[PDB]
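Standup notes, protein team

Yesterday: finished cleaning the Escherichia coli K-12 set.
Today: ATP-dependent RNA helicase DeaD structure.
Blockers: none.

Input for ATP-dependent RNA helicase DeaD:
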Amino acid sequence: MADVGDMQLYRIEVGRDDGVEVRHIVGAIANEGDISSRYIGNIKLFASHSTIELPKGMPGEVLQHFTRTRILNKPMNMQLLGDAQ
């Protein structure tokens, strides 16, 4: 029920072996904005990777400010594999 419906699956280069969990990337984005632990789509947590889908429908906010600054939570080294339905 976002403004547009931007829905995709982005995987980061961070996992349990790195220092991140399922409640880490979730509670981070869920606490930063209005997003909730349930609102989030599918979330993955590998050894050194993790996926997540945001129902948000108006990106470009974090990519602007956090364009050079990122972390386990922020898009440090992730890529777009999904696509907006």
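Follow-up from PR in the comments: The two ends are 13 Å apart (CA to CA).
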